[PDB]
Tab-separated table of C-alpha atoms in Angstrom:
chain	number	residue	atom	x	y	z
D	1	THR	CA	13.319	-0.675	11.312
D	2	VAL	CA	13.300	-3.761	9.007
D	3	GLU	CA	10.369	-5.587	10.489
D	4	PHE	CA	8.078	-2.766	9.659
D	5	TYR	CA	8.370	-3.013	5.951
D	6	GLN	CA	7.868	-6.744	6.496
D	7	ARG	CA	4.463	-5.951	7.371
D	8	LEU	CA	3.584	-4.097	4.698
D	9	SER	CA	1.534	-5.374	1.835
D	10	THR	CA	3.538	-5.928	-1.563
D	11	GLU	CA	1.960	-3.304	-3.461
D	12	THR	CA	3.140	-0.725	-0.808
D	13	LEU	CA	6.480	-1.960	-1.065
D	14	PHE	CA	6.295	-1.509	-4.847
D	15	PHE	CA	4.904	2.106	-4.609
D	16	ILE	CA	7.937	2.825	-1.954
D	17	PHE	CA	10.155	1.317	-4.523
D	18	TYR	CA	9.571	3.131	-7.436
D	19	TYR	CA	8.146	6.680	-6.217
D	20	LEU	CA	10.695	7.085	-3.476
D	21	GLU	CA	13.954	6.549	-4.984
D	22	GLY	CA	17.343	7.128	-3.271
D	23	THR	CA	15.912	7.140	0.131
D	24	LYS	CA	15.885	4.804	3.051
D	25	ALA	CA	12.320	3.396	2.899
D	26	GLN	CA	13.347	2.061	-0.935
D	27	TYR	CA	16.142	0.309	0.593
D	28	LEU	CA	14.309	-1.661	2.961
D	29	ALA	CA	11.621	-2.144	0.937
D	30	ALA	CA	13.845	-4.012	-1.769
D	31	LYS	CA	14.914	-6.125	1.075
D	32	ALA	CA	11.610	-6.923	2.416
D	33	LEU	CA	10.787	-8.085	-0.927
D	34	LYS	CA	13.532	-10.272	-1.504
D	35	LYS	CA	12.631	-11.961	2.063
D	36	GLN	CA	9.660	-12.554	0.063
D	37	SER	CA	11.349	-14.124	-2.522
D	38	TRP	CA	10.621	-11.603	-4.739
D	39	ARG	CA	13.898	-10.827	-7.117
D	40	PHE	CA	14.612	-7.615	-9.402
D	41	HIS	CA	15.194	-8.045	-13.286
D	42	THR	CA	17.639	-5.441	-13.708
D	43	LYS	CA	16.591	-5.159	-17.228
D	44	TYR	CA	12.658	-5.551	-17.347
D	45	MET	CA	12.812	-3.231	-14.317
D	46	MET	CA	10.300	-5.352	-12.224
D	47	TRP	CA	10.063	-7.827	-9.397
D	48	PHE	CA	9.501	-11.386	-10.158
D	49	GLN	CA	8.422	-14.453	-8.039
D	50	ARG	CA	8.317	-18.012	-9.091
D	51	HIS	CA	4.905	-19.004	-9.156
D	52	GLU	CA	5.577	-22.630	-9.103
D	53	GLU	CA	9.244	-24.635	-9.794
D	54	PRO	CA	10.845	-23.856	-12.752
D	55	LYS	CA	11.068	-26.183	-15.548
D	56	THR	CA	14.545	-26.113	-16.186
D	57	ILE	CA	17.456	-24.383	-14.325
D	58	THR	CA	21.176	-24.346	-15.333
D	59	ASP	CA	23.800	-22.277	-13.848
D	60	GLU	CA	22.922	-19.210	-16.138
D	61	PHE	CA	19.255	-19.059	-16.057
D	62	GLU	CA	15.981	-20.569	-15.145
D	63	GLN	CA	12.481	-21.157	-17.222
D	64	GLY	CA	9.060	-21.459	-15.816
D	65	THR	CA	6.130	-19.451	-14.580
D	66	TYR	CA	6.229	-16.214	-12.679
D	67	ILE	CA	3.780	-13.642	-11.447
D	68	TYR	CA	5.491	-10.062	-11.702
D	69	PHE	CA	4.465	-6.600	-11.034
D	70	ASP	CA	4.040	-4.248	-14.104
D	71	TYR	CA	4.594	-0.856	-12.785
D	72	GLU	CA	3.642	0.671	-16.177
D	73	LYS	CA	0.099	-1.014	-15.674
D	74	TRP	CA	0.464	-0.954	-11.773
D	75	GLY	CA	-0.936	-4.221	-11.323
D	76	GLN	CA	0.498	-8.219	-10.709
D	77	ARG	CA	0.599	-9.883	-13.761
D	78	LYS	CA	1.615	-13.638	-14.910
D	79	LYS	CA	3.943	-14.893	-17.407
D	80	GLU	CA	4.343	-18.443	-18.507
D	81	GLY	CA	7.445	-19.876	-20.354
D	82	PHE	CA	9.565	-17.270	-19.080
D	83	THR	CA	13.214	-17.418	-19.204
D	84	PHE	CA	15.091	-15.708	-16.253
D	85	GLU	CA	18.770	-15.042	-17.117
D	86	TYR	CA	20.667	-14.848	-14.096
D	87	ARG	CA	22.891	-11.837	-15.292
D	88	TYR	CA	19.716	-9.813	-15.091
D	89	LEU	CA	20.113	-10.594	-11.530
D	90	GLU	CA	21.517	-8.194	-8.816
K	1	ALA	CA	-0.754	8.379	-14.153
K	2	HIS	CA	0.732	11.902	-13.492
K	3	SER	CA	1.949	11.608	-9.815
K	4	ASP	CA	0.860	15.157	-9.042
K	5	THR	CA	-3.054	14.445	-9.596
K	6	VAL	CA	-5.767	12.916	-7.503
K	7	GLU	CA	-6.308	10.238	-10.244
K	8	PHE	CA	-2.700	8.802	-9.415
K	9	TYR	CA	-3.236	8.186	-5.862
K	10	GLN	CA	-6.594	6.647	-6.785
K	11	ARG	CA	-5.113	3.578	-8.223
K	12	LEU	CA	-3.096	2.797	-4.903
K	13	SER	CA	-4.420	0.504	-2.297
K	14	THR	CA	-5.644	2.027	0.962
K	15	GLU	CA	-2.996	0.350	2.995
K	16	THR	CA	-0.341	2.404	0.586
K	17	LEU	CA	-2.669	5.719	1.091
K	18	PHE	CA	-2.058	5.020	4.879
K	19	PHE	CA	1.358	4.775	4.693
K	20	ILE	CA	1.589	7.724	2.211
K	21	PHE	CA	-0.387	9.578	4.852
K	22	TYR	CA	1.466	9.180	7.917
K	23	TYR	CA	5.102	8.594	6.708
K	24	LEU	CA	5.112	11.346	3.924
K	25	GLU	CA	4.015	13.879	6.580
K	26	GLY	CA	3.092	17.400	5.255
K	27	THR	CA	3.584	17.150	1.396
K	28	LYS	CA	1.522	17.204	-1.785
K	29	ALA	CA	1.166	13.362	-1.600
K	30	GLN	CA	-0.153	13.199	1.583
K	31	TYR	CA	-2.696	15.850	0.483
K	32	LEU	CA	-3.889	14.056	-2.309
K	33	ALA	CA	-3.816	10.900	-0.500
K	34	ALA	CA	-6.256	12.248	2.109
K	35	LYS	CA	-8.513	12.978	-0.914
K	36	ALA	CA	-8.056	9.814	-2.471
K	37	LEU	CA	-9.441	8.292	0.983
K	38	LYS	CA	-12.673	10.483	1.243
K	39	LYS	CA	-14.011	9.293	-1.854
K	40	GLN	CA	-13.786	5.942	-0.304
K	41	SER	CA	-15.900	6.994	2.502
K	42	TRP	CA	-12.846	7.297	5.098
K	43	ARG	CA	-12.875	10.560	7.432
K	44	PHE	CA	-10.086	11.450	9.780
K	45	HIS	CA	-11.145	12.075	13.329
K	46	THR	CA	-8.516	14.729	14.215
K	47	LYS	CA	-8.463	13.568	18.065
K	48	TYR	CA	-7.787	10.080	17.583
K	49	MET	CA	-5.968	10.862	14.382
K	50	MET	CA	-6.858	8.019	12.870
K	51	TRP	CA	-9.321	7.107	9.546
K	52	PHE	CA	-12.858	5.781	10.146
K	53	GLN	CA	-15.334	4.301	7.815
K	54	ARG	CA	-18.761	3.455	8.490
K	55	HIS	CA	-19.203	-0.426	8.528
K	56	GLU	CA	-23.052	0.250	8.283
K	57	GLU	CA	-25.685	2.697	8.734
K	58	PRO	CA	-24.995	4.841	11.875
K	59	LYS	CA	-27.803	4.113	14.587
K	60	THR	CA	-28.191	7.925	15.905
K	61	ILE	CA	-27.541	10.975	13.963
K	62	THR	CA	-27.772	14.618	14.902
K	63	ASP	CA	-26.052	18.115	14.104
K	64	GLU	CA	-23.047	17.349	16.447
K	65	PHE	CA	-22.267	13.662	16.165
K	66	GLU	CA	-23.400	10.149	14.963
K	67	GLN	CA	-23.212	6.845	16.614
K	68	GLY	CA	-22.870	3.345	15.254
K	69	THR	CA	-20.127	0.765	13.976
K	70	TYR	CA	-17.142	1.633	12.320
K	71	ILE	CA	-13.866	-0.016	10.889
K	72	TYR	CA	-10.400	2.176	11.387
K	73	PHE	CA	-7.090	2.137	10.696
K	74	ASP	CA	-4.819	1.896	13.901
K	75	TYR	CA	-1.532	3.128	13.193
K	76	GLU	CA	0.217	2.026	16.038
K	77	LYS	CA	-0.728	-1.621	15.522
K	78	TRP	CA	-0.745	-0.726	11.693
K	79	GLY	CA	-3.766	-2.693	11.088
K	80	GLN	CA	-7.646	-2.349	10.145
K	81	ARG	CA	-9.795	-2.905	13.436
K	82	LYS	CA	-13.282	-2.625	14.382
K	83	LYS	CA	-15.482	-0.306	16.927
K	84	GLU	CA	-19.063	-0.835	18.238
K	85	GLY	CA	-21.370	1.672	19.399
K	86	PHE	CA	-18.836	3.904	18.730
K	87	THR	CA	-19.685	8.166	19.157
K	88	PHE	CA	-17.894	10.017	16.409
K	89	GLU	CA	-18.011	13.751	17.229
K	90	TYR	CA	-18.210	15.878	14.192
K	91	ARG	CA	-16.241	18.702	16.125
K	92	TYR	CA	-13.331	15.991	15.530
K	93	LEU	CA	-13.855	16.038	11.905
K	94	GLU	CA	-11.930	17.898	9.208
K	95	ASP	CA	-14.514	19.548	6.972
K	96	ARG	CA	-18.258	19.419	7.922
């Protein structure tokens, strides 16, 4: 169901997303995350979430501070003065 | 780390390990997850089929059972709960 993945911790959703590819579970984790206001950067291949309100927003990109989950370090990190180009959005 | 080792599931959070354990049933992952949980002093009660952890030193300890307070992961509510004056019978334990 959709509500279950809603309950799961974010770290659990990430594990599901990165290690159970091409499966239903991944599919619902992706959406569970989106509803939590995470967005997938299709290049960096990591999930981002606004830490606070962006500094600048145009029609093509926004810049500001974000927390993201680095799957290589398996840990939530933070980036300031980052430019999230919407063309890398799904 | 390499997904096929215990050092890998050791990096994951407990809740994730529980997810792995219940929803990737009968797989290598589940087994290594089970192991990961055991270093953390979680033990599997084979009747209730839930994981328990001593909250504090047990009150009584014999050869067949121990008694005291535990936290446990209820997989029907999917949440950590707590039990006082609980008897954990050693016959319902994976490996003595």
